[PDB]
């Protein structure tokens, strides 16, 4: 007469029929499974376990530093931005070669290795010779130059794949024109004046550091790295600012919990004595501690109601980063403003 098998369950079914299926006349409502740290990885643990464990004391001491309470001592690590003046200096080429200063401890200067072509420590930046002395033999030796400014101007051109067609030069009247004979020390000055007239060079003071080797191969690397450092400091500042924003609410929660726990301990220890002596009516202290605990919780803890005060964002949830661009941009802008203000003050 009765059903001999177990009926399968279906979603959204009435409680009475649920109990009919179960036959146990009750069941938990919340499975409580969402508090699981995670389903076991479903592996094969039969592999021979290691024969050398690490004493749990060492592991506890190893993980202790990650959970210590926040203090004002570590609230000053962040809020510190460091030095921002010295790294952004560009020194010039030094006078004494490192070998000489090294020799400036004993009698090791007896040998002079001044380059024959590097007289006066400036082999370049000294126009010398003219096309009259040009020869195949000398073409292999840098005995002839044109001066610094003219060299830079000429190399400023760029090769494509005519460029010397001047507007009115095609006329025989221009063809008949003559010219003087200048010299490199004069051509450089003339080019300087011309670029002054155009606007590519500063106007002279109201009434050229070619010896510093400022384009040296080292200087380019120094400039690159200085740009990178100025780039990174702002990002570090933004991240530290966000961390400061979070740490303060965390500290407030710490200060609330450290007072909640004392009441918890007192109310817990004021009942163990009842079991110990086995008694009778509840004491006045045990009656009035519960109201105090409930008042504290229900009133004060409402402020900390936000869920994030005790949770650690998980990667699996998705874009849970606390460093979203939409806020990092503004943090970086504010940090740059602060840096500019400090520079103006400094």
């Amino acid at each position: 007469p009765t059903v001999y098998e177990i009926r399968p369950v279906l979603p959204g079914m009435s409680e009475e029929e649920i109990k009919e299926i179960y036959s146990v006349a009750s069941y938990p409502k919340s499975d409580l499974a969402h508090l699981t740290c995670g389903e076991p990885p479903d592996r094969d643990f039969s592999n021979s376990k290691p024969t050398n464990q690490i004493n749990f004391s060492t592991f506890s001491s190893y993980i202790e530093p990650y959970f210590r309470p926040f203090t004002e001592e570590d609230l000053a690590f962040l809020r510190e931005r460091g030095d921002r003046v010295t790294p952004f200096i560009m020194p010039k080429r030094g006078k004494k070669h490192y070998t000489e200063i090294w020799a400036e401890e004993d009698g090791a200067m007896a040998i002079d290795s001044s380059p024959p072509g590097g007289r006066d420590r400036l082999p370049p930046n000294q126009a010398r010779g003219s096309i009259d002395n040009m020869d195949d033999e000398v073409a292999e030796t840098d005995k002839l130059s044109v001066g610094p400014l003219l060299t830079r101007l000429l190399q400023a051109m760029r090769p494509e794949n005519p460029a010397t067609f001047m507007p009115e030069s095609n006329t025989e009247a221009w063809k008949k024109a003559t010219h003087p004979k200048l010299d490199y020390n004069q051509v450089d000055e003339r080019i300087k004046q011309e670029l002054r007239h155009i606007g590519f060079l500063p106007l002279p003071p109201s009434s050229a550091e070619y010896d510093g080797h400022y384009d040296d191969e080292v200087a380019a690397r120094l400039r690159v790295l200085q740009a990178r450092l100025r780039e990174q400091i702002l990002l570090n500042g933004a991240r530290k600012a966000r961390l400061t924003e979070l740490v303060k609410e965390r500290m407030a929660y710490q200060e609330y919990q450290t007072i909640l726990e004392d009441l918890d301990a007192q109310v817990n220890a004021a009942y163990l004595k009842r079991t110990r002596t086995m008694g009778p009516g509840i004491g006045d202290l045990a009656r009035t501690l519960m109201d105090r605990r409930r008042r504290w919780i229900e009133q004060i803890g409402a402020v900390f109601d936000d869920e994030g005060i005790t949770k650690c964002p998980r990667v699996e949830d998705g874009d849970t980063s606390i460093f979203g661009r939409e806020i990092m941009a503004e943090l970086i802008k504010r940090e740059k403003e602060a840096w500019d203000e400090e520079v103006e003050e400094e």
Binding site: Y4, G94, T164, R221
Partner: protein, 464 residues
């Protein structure tokens, strides 16, 4: 005996006849008088049994297939009786009771196929008792012979069967297989937790039977509410344990060896910085913490490299190779009296990840924060150009340094020749004849020709 069955013994020979064909006297004068077939064959009579004029009944053993060809009525009945006694599921005892050397696997499969997993429901077999095809299909003699042969073969095999291997020590789970004293990866539970002494306050709690609500007030009586209030704290302690475990699982803090090795490989200042930045891991995920630490390390390395280069530039060192040479010689001198990040940033070739701004122009940080070939002129051997030999090498364009090498001419003479040719061309609208350039160069014909072709291809002059 724990068995609840009934043992039947003959009333003449006192021999068990429960599992054998026997004959019973039907005369009312004899009550429960069972005679074994040998007793009713040899005709040994006792008490009031009269084998001369009293009718008898033949008790058959019911040996023939009904459900399974290899199983008879007696075996099925023993199966069900054991299920009643030994319980439906305890297969070893029921299999032993049935007999026939049917291992627990065979009995289990038989019961499943015949009753549990079959084209049938709790009404056994196809339709009804009227179906008698199987019993008539095989004669009783053939089935008995097959059973006897099987039993004899199994008995001989068991007599000659190898002895069972002794049971080894039971395979204890020992959940401590992880590389940590007191951790159970299969359960995700430690053996010593955060507040393992939290149970010390609730391990003696007892509740009054049948209570819970005041019979008068309708509110929980004072002792009940006091007892309940000391469970909330225990639940909160459990939740705190859970949160601590959740933090531990992320960041891979369970890898002692890897983390310790990585910490060892680092230098002193980086180690101090990481130890200072450690506490903030609780508020970030894995990637965020990795980016934070990497950014700090990158800033430190950049500062070190910039300081090193500034120190170099003041000693008159004019190239990275000579800088490294000087550093080696200074190490050797201070002795007389893998490479680190600061040593990679100053390498002659910069790392790829330092050739683009970290945060773009519009203020948003990047997501990944942390040619004309002149022919070789005959009889021309190119000479390598070195920064020590060529003073003004760092200005020539890449398209012209190849020509300089191929033509065996130093930079400054090349610049002078370029200037002279440019002046001569510009003076005359930019057009000149090939012999004009050949004369202007004042060198071998091939060299002047090649330089003129390069210039005209570039576009700074035009051939007349």
């Amino acid at each position: 005996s724990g068995e609840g069955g009934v043992k039947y013994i003959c009333d003449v020979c006192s021999v068990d006849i429960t599992s054998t064909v026997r004959i019973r006297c039907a005369d009312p004068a004899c009550h429960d008088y069972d005679l074994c077939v040998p007793c009713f064959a040899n005709g040994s009579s006792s008490n009031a049994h009269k084998p001369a004029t009293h009718s008898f009944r033949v008790i058959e053993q019911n040996s023939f297939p009904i459900f399974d060809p290899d199983w008879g009525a007696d075996e099925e009945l023993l199966l069900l009786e054991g299920a009643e006694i030994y319980g439906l599921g305890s297969w070893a005892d029921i299999a032993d009771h049935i007999g026939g050397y049917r291992t627990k696997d065979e009995v289990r499969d038989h019961y499943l196929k015949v009753y549990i997993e079959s084209p049938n429901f709790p009404l056994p077999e196809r339709c009804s008792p009227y179906d008698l095809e199987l019993p008539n299909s095989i004669s009783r003699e053939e089935f008995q012979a097959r059973k006897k042969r099987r039993i004899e073969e199994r008995r001989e095999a068991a007599k000659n069967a190898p002895p069972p291997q002794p049971k080894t020590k039971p395979t204890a789970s020992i959940p401590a297989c992880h590389e940590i004293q007191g951790y159970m990866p299969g359960r995700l539970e430690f053996e010593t937790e955060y507040c393992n002494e939290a149970e010390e306050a609730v391990q003696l709690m007892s509740f009054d039977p049948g209570d819970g609500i005041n019979p008068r007030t309708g509110e929980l009586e004072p002792e009940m509410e006091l007892k309940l209030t000391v469970m909330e704290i225990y639940n909160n302690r459990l939740t705190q344990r859970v949160e601590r475990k959740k933090v531990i699982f992320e960041h891979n803090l369970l890898e002692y060896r890897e983390n310790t090795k990585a910490e060892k490989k680092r230098s002193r200042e980086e180690r101090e910085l990481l130890n200072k930045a450690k506490p903030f891991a609780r508020m970030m995920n894995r990637h965020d913490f990795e980016q934070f630490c990497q950014g700090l390390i990158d800033e430190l390395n950049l500062r070190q490299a910039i300081a090193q280069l500034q120190e170099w530039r003041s000693m008159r060192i004019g190239d990275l190779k000579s800088g490294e040479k000087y550093e080696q010689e200074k190490a050797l001198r201070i002795q007389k009296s893998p490479p680190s990040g600061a040593a990679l940033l100053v390498a002659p070739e910069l790392p790829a990840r330092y050739k683009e701004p970290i945060i773009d122009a519009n203020g948003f940080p990047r997501p990944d924060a942390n040619k004309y070939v002149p022919p070789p002129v005959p009889g021309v051997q190119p000479m390598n150009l070195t920064q020590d030999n060529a003073p003004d090498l760092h200005l020539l364009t890449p398209e012209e340094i190849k020509l300089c090498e191929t033509l065996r001419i130093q930079p400054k003479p090349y610049i002078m020749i370029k200037e002279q040719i440019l002046k001569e061309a510009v003076k005359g609208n930019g057009s000149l004849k090939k012999k004009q350039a050949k004369e202007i160069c004042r060198l071998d014909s091939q060299k002047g020709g090649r330089i003129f072709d390069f210039m005209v291809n570039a576009g700074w002059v035009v051939k007349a």
